[PDB]
């Protein structure tokens, strides 16, 4: 039968703007760097892994086997096994969904699963000025205008873009003033800090800026203080089967339980680019028969303020889940009290392959922070879902 | 519960000589080819595939989202995601060991893997470039030749490896035992690389490209895979789809094992890995090396094959280096790569995985049909990779 | 062909490096380890017909350093000298030098062996440095790769380690160095030996080498340290020796010098000298097992294993070295009776000039407790750095 | 004891220094040469089982030279090899170490050779000891003390570079030297030499004392240079098809007092050639071919004088008569150091391999019966010599 696979935590470089520092970061630099604060961290110097699975969007000539060459780079035994690994902005996520995979089966007892990009390589800096299907697709837009068209199709005031935007700074930057991310975070290239994070962010200061997105379709409302700037990042989450996790002195976090993937028609018009996981998440509750609200963290790429907020309204819109879903009912609405609680994209910074990654070890701490500081009876849930270049989208379901 | 995944066939395009046909082929030319090629095959038009998965190994910079590009450009449904992986020469088998796992997960009702690679405009054999696939100090081929001349294994056994290969394709191809598994492209319809007009003696006479210097040389052009274009992919199903859809399952994916090994400074030999795979995978599902009716390897040399089987041979070997007690033992080789495998059809890193799991699938299907007395039977893949890695799988029929 | 006579040699003891002669040259420590040589022997005022060895980190500066050795010696000026580097081997390949010169007749009388400091030039071992003391990997690393593959175990290089100091104690305790070796800078002994050693003490430290791949068996107890040192050992024609009346040890036979094919890991780095042994043997007509003496130079004591191991499995014996079967496997009681280089030290260029004097002494007291027995022989073994490696044997 | 028969050699053109050669490693300059050599007699991928040799200038990181270049060559990595050094005579000696491991049987066939650059301007201008007076200061003392004329040394400085020239024009150099760095031929030589054109220009040593004669046109440039000689058993050269050109039979190396003063610092040869000689039952004068390095023709018409002087002979040598005179006619027949260069450890293979051919030319000429025979006679400085018998 299938084992339940244990997130045991992770680390990951902090996100540097893109041609600033870590301008000179190559692929390899930065992961190696991110595996190098994992094996710190846990104390796997000398073990050996069974799967070390990530990748790059953005990969160059020079990363051929990237995660095989970055362990052997590592502190690892050489004789861990490692594959590479890109869905776009999901690469992250569905390398933790291929670890966990192999955990469950049983050919694997511990794996580590992430991702790394650099923007830098390569003059608005941000992620929606880029080919729809992040190839440096064929319709003439950029993931920044074909998130404008859901936009307005669903009419997500400018207000609620900025004011999500801006509570994702103030909370990442609160998780920071609290140590949250210190045993989720190793420096690289004097860097400790998120550089794209700024603490004194509000409502107020992101209304000034104009509209960039969707311009001539009228009522602009996206602009560079609610969508993604290009980041360098790399990121890495640890996984393993309980007998090791007890059998290192390692306790777990949470539990991946089950994820969905889902693509969307895109080309035609029919969907939004970024509007996959709509798609996603209603099966993957179903699988599991839970509802949207039996949640207790949400966890949503923030690619742009609208685009989460789009999900959201989608998820509430009779209409929606009527006609593109075939639900026969509104999925609801969740607690946004409960959503992306200690920041996310729009503080920390989109490296496309990295994100997942992130994502994960966070959903884990905080299920496990809530689990243990208090408690009483009920099992704790987390859904986390990602909008990926391509419409394609990858969501998961962890339990603690 | 772990479901059962099945394997209903693939479809792989024939495999041409490098800067010969194919030349002007891009990888998704190619993969794409493949892809509309199985769907023909099975009707899969305007249907949703739960996964495709898949990738090639020395991409060049246009080929981002490779599989779901070749998906937008298929007759699949655009509901069908994909996404891209690459493990050098086993590409293919990682990506079907992944969808199979998202079939056995509860997560996939069907999914397409395998894989495909372009490598002209990157002698002309796949020995001749670094061990990494990019720059150790050292090309593949001469590590394989170390290897070898370190096991000692003779240039007849080389020999006849390699031509036995071509032959058995030959016979294969006159026979229709392709007929369900390729798929035309840019004029060709069976394997370039063949030739049945090859023997022990005419390969006798070539004169040794690896292992020189050192002296004691067995590695020719001819015992050697040389570079090829290629695509193929592989459909697997939960039985209930396979059912649903009025398709039998061919064989079943049971279990699958990757390793890695410390080649770089010369513990382990690059293209081992498979040794250490494949014991670890017979103990988990309790069975021993003499105990499947097929056995596909990997002819990325003819030594190497050999040396896999050496390997388990001595017990030096296997106590020493696997930590087994005892030697894995030896091979009926009447049973292994039965229809040949690539040092006849060629080597496009991440196409071989798929036609080998497709070809190995179908062998099994085909002998319990004739064998109607009851019996498990069953089927072990093992691919060695650059990079020091290897993948191994067992299929049941 | 006329047979060849080890009068014996005198020697400096070793010191670890970057202490004791930390200011001495290797011109220095080799004209102190020669006038004691001289003085022993008495060839004060003496012509001998060649003076050849050297030094394998050699500074610059130094360039005729065995002939300005000589000047600044108290043997004649006439005495003629050249320079000679083979790595860890320079020293025996010194003494082959010489013994080919006096059976070719040339000579009548030579003195060879070798010099090196370390001082000047990572806990201060030998394996830290590059394979060819210039694949980029260090000595420490090949060992330990072949060491690992070969299934050597840590038990038994510490057992031989802290034997080679045990017994090299008790052989100065006995006196047995007293007219082997000479006073320098204030040492009588060598800095590195440790009579309170033992398995217990030498399984306590952590292994330095090879350890990310896995099973590392390679302590800084079981490796040679750097050490500074200096040795000669004197030779001649058998008329020569009479001519002076100085007593033989023993002759030196013959000798076998080979490398190995370890760039790219076909062999490992320091098993040249088990390709060379058998074609000795086989050239002579002995076996493995038809020595009294085995003098094995240590530079780790898995390297030193490595070479039983080799010859013990016909496995090996054929895939390799090409012989039908095994050499076989010897009574570890003749194995480096008096220590070797675990304890004393490694200047590259000395141990050569060390082994020879000692292992002749050796054979030539045991012929000399013994009466009515026949010929009595040692086999000399030194593995050397770019992968080569030199053997000899003696009679007595 | 077998014997040690020549097979030839290969070598570089000896460029002048800081000139063709001044961004060529000894590494690369002998690599050159011993990849020639393998080219000539197709001993790639042949384990030798020796090859000795070295660079007298040695440079930093130049540990295990000769190996790291068979390393870095066409040969089995299997080859051993370790280093040598004597001045001047290193290549010869070389030569002598190789010769004494096939004929004790430890070898079956082994190259011989040596490397030196100097461009990183006369050799008389270095330390007696390459490491207070210089090497042509030290030899200009011994030349007005041997009373060596000055139309001599001119005579026999443009002899050599007019001898070589003619055996350049015979072809005699195509199967000994390998081109590098597109040089052919020794640039070092200028074959119009007239004895007149060098009477022209002025004496650089021993000039203060009054009457000095060595010139510098008369003095050996600073070369640079590899060479290497192949040798092996009769066994060997057979089984592989290659013919002996000639037999090392037997060598002698010698030393002298020269710091004091009371003998001359390259004159060490004088007290080596007469020992070998009778060791071997010979005279000065039983030999078909002289080859004696020419460091100063100062120093090697001073050596003639010594052999046929007046009982130095019985004085600083210690026998009844002396030596005497040989035929000018068979001494360096093609040229020598004098004309092609000095690079210190490549001269020694240079002279071996010559004199090896020499001996096979006039064997295949005169087929009567008879037994041929080469003197080799080199000064080194440290105050040595070495001397050697080729026969065939």
Known sequence: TRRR????????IPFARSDGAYADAS???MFTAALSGLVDRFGLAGERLDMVVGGAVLKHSRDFNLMRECVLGSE????????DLQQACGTGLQAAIAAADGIAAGRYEVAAAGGVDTTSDPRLKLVGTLPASLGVPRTGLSMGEHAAVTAKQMGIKRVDQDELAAASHRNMADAYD?????????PFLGLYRDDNLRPNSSVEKLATLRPVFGVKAGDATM??????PLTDGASVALLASEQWAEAHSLAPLAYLVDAETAAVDYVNGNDGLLMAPTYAVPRLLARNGLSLQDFDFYEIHEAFA???????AAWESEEYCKRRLGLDAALGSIDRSKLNVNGSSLAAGHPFAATGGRILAQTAKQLAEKKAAKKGGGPLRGLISICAAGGQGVAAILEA
Not at 178 to 186: I, T
């Open 5 to 12: 696979v244990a997130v045991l935590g992770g680390n990951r």
């Open 27 to 29: 692929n390899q630099d």
């Open 76 to 83: 690892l035994s050489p004789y861990t096994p490692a594959f």
């Open 178 to 186: 609290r140590g949250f991310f210190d045993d989720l975070v190793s």
């Open 223 to 228: 602009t560079a203080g609610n969508s993604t």
């Open 306 to 312: 609208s685009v989460v907020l789009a999900h959201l």
